[PDB]
Amino acid sequence: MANKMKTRKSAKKRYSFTVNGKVKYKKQNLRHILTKKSSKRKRNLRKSGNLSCFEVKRIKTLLPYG
Amino acid sequence: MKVILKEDFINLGKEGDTVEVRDGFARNYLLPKGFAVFSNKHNIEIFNQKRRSILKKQEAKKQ
Amino acid sequence: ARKCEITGKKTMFGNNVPRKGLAKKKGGAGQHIGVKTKRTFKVNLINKKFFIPNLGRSVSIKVSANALRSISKIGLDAFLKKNCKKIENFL
RNA sequence: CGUGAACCUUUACUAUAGCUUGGUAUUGAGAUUUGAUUAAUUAAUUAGGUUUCUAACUUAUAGAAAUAUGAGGAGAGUGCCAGGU
RNA sequence: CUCUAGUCUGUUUAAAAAGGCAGGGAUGAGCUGUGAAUAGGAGUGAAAGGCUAAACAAACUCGGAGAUAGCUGGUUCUCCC
RNA sequence: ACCUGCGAGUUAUCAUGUCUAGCAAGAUUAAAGCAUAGAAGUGCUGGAGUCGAAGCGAAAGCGAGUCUUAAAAGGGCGAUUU
RNA sequence: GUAAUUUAAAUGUAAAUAUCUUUUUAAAAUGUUCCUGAGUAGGACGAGGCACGAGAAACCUUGUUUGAAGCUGGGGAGACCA
RNA sequence: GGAGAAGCAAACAUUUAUUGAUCCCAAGAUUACCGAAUGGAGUAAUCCAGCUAGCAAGAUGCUAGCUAUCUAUUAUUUAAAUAAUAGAGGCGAUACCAGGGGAAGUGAACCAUCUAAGUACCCUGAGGAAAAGAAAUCAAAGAGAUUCCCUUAGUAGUGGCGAGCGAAAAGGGAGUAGCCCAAACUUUAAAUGUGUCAAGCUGCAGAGCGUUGCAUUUAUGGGGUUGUAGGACGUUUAGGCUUA
Numbered sequence A: 001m002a003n004k005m006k007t008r009k010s011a012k013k014r015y016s017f018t019v020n021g022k023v024k025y026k027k028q029n030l031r032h033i034l035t036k037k038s039s040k041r042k043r044n045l046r047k048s049g050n051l052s053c054f055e056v057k058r059i060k061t062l063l064p065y066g
Numbered sequence B: 001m002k003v004i005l006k007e008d009f010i011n012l013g014k015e016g017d018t019v020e021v022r023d024g025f026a027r028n029y030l031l032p033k034g035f036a037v038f039s040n041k042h043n044i045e046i047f048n049q050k051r052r053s054i055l056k057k058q059e060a061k062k063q
Numbered sequence C: 001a002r003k004c005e006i007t008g009k010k011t012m013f014g015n016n017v018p019r020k021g022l023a024k025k026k027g028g029a030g031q032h033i034g035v036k037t038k039r040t041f042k043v044n045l046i047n048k049k050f051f052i053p054n055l056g057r058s059v060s061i062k063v064s065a066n067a068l069r070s071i072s073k074i075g076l077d078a079f080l081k082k083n084c085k086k087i088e089n090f091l
Numbered sequence D: 001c002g003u004g005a006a007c008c009u010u011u012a013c014u015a016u017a018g019c020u021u022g023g024u025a026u027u028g029a030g031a032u033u034u035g036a037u038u039a040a041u042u043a044a045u046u047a048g049g050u051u052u053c054u055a056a057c058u059u060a061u062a063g064a065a066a067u068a069u070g071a072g073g074a075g076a077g078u079g080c081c082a083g084g085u
Numbered sequence E: 001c002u003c004u005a006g007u008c009u010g011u012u013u014a015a016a017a018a019g020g021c022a023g024g025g026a027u028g029a030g031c032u033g034u035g036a037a038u039a040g041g042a043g044u045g046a047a048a049g050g051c052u053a054a055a056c057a058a059a060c061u062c063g064g065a066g067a068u069a070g071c072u073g074g075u076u077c078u079c080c081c
Numbered sequence F: 001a002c003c004u005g006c007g008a009g010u011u012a013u014c015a016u017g018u019c020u021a022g023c024a025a026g027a028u029u030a031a032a033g034c035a036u037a038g039a040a041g042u043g044c045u046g047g048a049g050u051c052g053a054a055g056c057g058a059a060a061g062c063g064a065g066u067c068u069u070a071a072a073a074g075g076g077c078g079a080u081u082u
Numbered sequence G: 001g002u003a004a005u006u007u008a009a010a011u012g013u014a015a016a017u018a019u020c021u022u023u024u025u026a027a028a029a030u031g032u033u034c035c036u037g038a039g040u041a042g043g044a045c046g047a048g049g050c051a052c053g054a055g056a057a058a059c060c061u062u063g064u065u066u067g068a069a070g071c072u073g074g075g076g077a078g079a080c081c082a
Numbered sequence H: 001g002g003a004g005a006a007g008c009a010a011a012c013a014u015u016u017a018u019u020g021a022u023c024c025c026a027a028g029a030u031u032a033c034c035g036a037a038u039g040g041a042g043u044a045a046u047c048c049a050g051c052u053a054g055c056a057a058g059a060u061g062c063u064a065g066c067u068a069u070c071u072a073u074u075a076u077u078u079a080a081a082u083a084a085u086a087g088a089g090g091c092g093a094u095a096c097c098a099g100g101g102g103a104a105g106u107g108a109a110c111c112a113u114c115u116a117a118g119u120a121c122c123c124u125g126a127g128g129a130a131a132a133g134a135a136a137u138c139a140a141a142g143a144g145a146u147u148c149c150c151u152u153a154g155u156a157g158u159g160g161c162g163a164g165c166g167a168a169a170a171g172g173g174a175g176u177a178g179c180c181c182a183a184a185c186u187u188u189a190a191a192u193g194u195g196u197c198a199a200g201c202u203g204c205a206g207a208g209c210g211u212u213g214c215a216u217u218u219a220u221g222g223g224g225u226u227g228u229a230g231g232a233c234g235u236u237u238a239g240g241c242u243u244a
Helices: A039-046 A056-062 B023-033 B044-055 C065-074 C076-082
Strands: A023-025 B002-005 B018-020 B036-038 C012-016 C019-022 C030-033 C037-041 C045-052 C057-064
Touching: B002 B023, B002 B044, B023 B036, B023 C065, B036 B044, C045 C065, C057 C065, C065 C076
Parallel strands: none
Antiparallel strands: B002 B018, B002 B036, C012 C037, C019 C030, C045 C057
8 A cells, every 4th residue: 555556647538448458549630620621531530449459558557457 | 993082073073972084083193182082882881971971961062 | 023013923935926828717728837936925014103191101012004903993902902912011 | 979967148938136117005184176977067976186284104313211302294115916127 | 575487307206386596576556473354156356267274167064865867887506498 | 916705676565467275256354352372473353345246328327238320220349158 | 590479668650548629509490681702704816725736616724905794693515696 | 688899800919898898779968160051251171250157368368158031920100120939041862743944856758837845954842742632513424522543545636637646525443531711790899981860779668869870901709601502581499597
């Protein structure tokens, strides 16, 4: 209790964990200038995605409890 | 500062009256010179009772 | 010291905090604190003279404008009594 | 060479001593017209402008102090807030 | 009695700044004994980034302090895949 | 310079993986108390709490479904085979 | 010396008992008046502490100013209003 | 406590100890000078005094006993001035606690916000613990003073939303304890002000016109301490009497 590993809050506020490992996240580029972006591009950016399996280990280090 | 006049003044009131005056006026002039006294219990009440019983009226000022 | 001889008020140490930007309650995106420095807030003592008819003489005391206001409100003897000080400690 | 260290300079950036301006407390009483606002030139407030008397306050002398006398003055000084440098 | 241009010795020297020869001042902006005053982002400086206990482009001691280094160095017995 | 001594991945906690031991849809007590002993023990007492057992959705909320949507119409994340 | 026992004239530290000291030498019981903490509560500006950096920023302390009610009351319930 | 002792180690020659030594413990005496050092002064371990007593006291003689300062309380016109007692000065703990002052090296691979951090350190206070402590509280649960643990929990939030910082309530424990003033009224007065009438008193009567008349302050006793109860008024009361 003297040294509980601290979670990385800025990472907690962006990453989420699925039940068997994958990491859910919100896609970028749908926050700002949007008139020029095509409608199908924007529609795909709206729907949430899953990260590549290459970041999952680092993310599991960043979120020691969540 | 509410003050009770030990005498009469041109714009303030009569001996025995209580008036609101600016604090500098009260503290630097009236209180030290004796023209008036602080409107406290044990002073205001004593002065009012004495004025109403022993004095009981204007000393020829009204006439 | 810069100490009210009646109440005991003394100077208070704090910061000096500059701010850049526009507050959100004025439409701005916010404010940012700059480099804080150290500073002091000073009591404004007044070397006042109170004429006491009770011994027909004037006594000079270091009081703050706040204590002057309170004396004007309550009376010097009562105020000294409330702060457990006596006029003879002055002079 | 190291997103090294220190010093110095500047019309580099950001603070700040100090200086300066305004408001307010300290800070009262007068006289006068410059107005604004509110209603009906009048009346109720309020910022000022030009002036006055000293009791606040502070300069000179005597005194340990108290106190007194002679001059300034509700100014200045000192806090707090704000504007410049 | 106080100073050091020029030259030489010395430079693992006798001396962590001298000595051997010489030169300047030498009644004055003079030398010096004995006390005292000015302490570190400060003092002092007839002004050279000088001095302030043999070291000063910010003295020394203690503490923070085991400061931080993408830099350098070091990291100890054995065998098999 | 030689030689001889001294001279560097440790400890405390959290996360996670593996091994070992035990129980099992459950597992486990922390602080602390009592008893004996004087023997900084170890046998009990103590379940407050934590991790599994249901997830999805920003959330409300709904649930082996949920969200995106008029739509299980197609997918995203689940599961019925722990 | 160790186990289990055990020396206190005097001194120091502890309780308990009286002495001593002090207090009640009374309480259950209805409505009218008095008081119930004043430059204080609060507000404006400038700061600090609350985990909380002005952020919607409560609340508390607090410097400069201003300023209350008096149980027919006031404070608090994370802006504020009921 | 009993046979050695003359320190910490013996030596060399001198005594003591069974007349109870040495030594240990308790108490008392002695206790130079400096040092908070305090009669003044001073280069700390020392010169210079004032007064009193004794040395033939005496010509810079010696010894003993007093004269420092601050604060509180009064002996007075507590300021001035002495007098009276009472409590403090400094050291110790390179520990702990409270109050005040408050960085910088770092991290953010810079830095200016932030972090480090109320950290180091400085200063003022006492204690054996301190601080705090009996709700104008927590907080939407029905609890009930303060403090210290286990959990809640790395949670809720905050943060150039960058790095980081980081609760509280509830629950489970250690340990337990609640109280007292001011004010509301009244008594005893004093001091300071003001006052010559219906001002005091539970209410009929007589006396009575100032029981100091009414207030404030100081001092004493009764009265009382809270989801608004305590006093003046409402009764049974009020052990019982003496005083009013």
